[PDB]
Ligand binder design. Structure first.
Ligand SMILES: Nc1nc(=O)c2ncn([C@@H]3O[C@H](CSP(=O)(O)O)[C@@H](O)[C@H]3O)c2[nH]1
Ligand SMILES: [Cl-]
Lengths: 115, 112
């Protein structure tokens, strides 16, 4: 079972349903089940990386691809006033699923500080 | 249009620089929102993530790898939050792409 057995690994393998926005050979974008903004989705690699703190130097293009896919999906979803991208690392970051993921939130004014 | 981050890259105004290479610069935010709050910015003037090109993919990932390495060097062993703001709803404060890295305290949900 490639991608691991976190919830996100199971979503990658179509074993648990998700509302998918975009999929390619590197990543998957799908809506967050507990949205914190009118639009709130996740972009995740298909390769399993537990957290950003352990990503390898060779993961650079993949991590950048998450952001490129994130911004393309945001435009496809009509987030013309903007959005916020978030990666949570570890306990202080609030991380609750140990498979790297980028949040994209929009459709309302986001506030500062970002949590 | 040039921005204050362009001036910082060109060393025309001071900033507390954490790391630099040939393609990016990391420095502490002048208005910190956490005990550790720094930025990683590309030297290439990409005004906002929404206009980043496909060929910029590796560079954007480089900002995150540099960010996570700087976070480790700054002692953020309990974690941190990375943020990119786009546009008015995103609260983007400077129209030069920048990755925020925040830690040294519990970050909360929602993230703004
Ligand atoms: N679509 C979806 N299906 C799930 O079965 C699930 N399970 C968690 N999630 C979201 O992933 C983030 C983890 S918290 P983090 O590690 O990003 O801090 C939170 O926004 C959840 O609502 C999920 N989303
Ligand atoms: Cl900003």
């Amino acid at each position: 079972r490639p991608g691991g057995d976190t919830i996100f690994g199971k979503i990658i393998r179509k074993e648990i349903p998700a509302k998918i926005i975009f999929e390619d050979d590197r990543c998957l974008a799908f809506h967050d089940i507990s949205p914190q903004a009118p639009t709130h989705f996740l972009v995740i690699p298909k390769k399993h990386i537990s957290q950003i703190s352990v990503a390898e130097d060779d993961d650079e293009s993949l991590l950048g691809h998450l952001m490129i896919v994130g911004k393309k999906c945001a435009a496809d979803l009509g987030l013309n006033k903007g959005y916020r991208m978030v990666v949570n690392e570890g306990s202080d970051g609030g991380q609750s699923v140990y498979h790297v993921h980028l949040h994209v939130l929009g459709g309302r004014q986001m506030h500062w500080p970002p949590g």
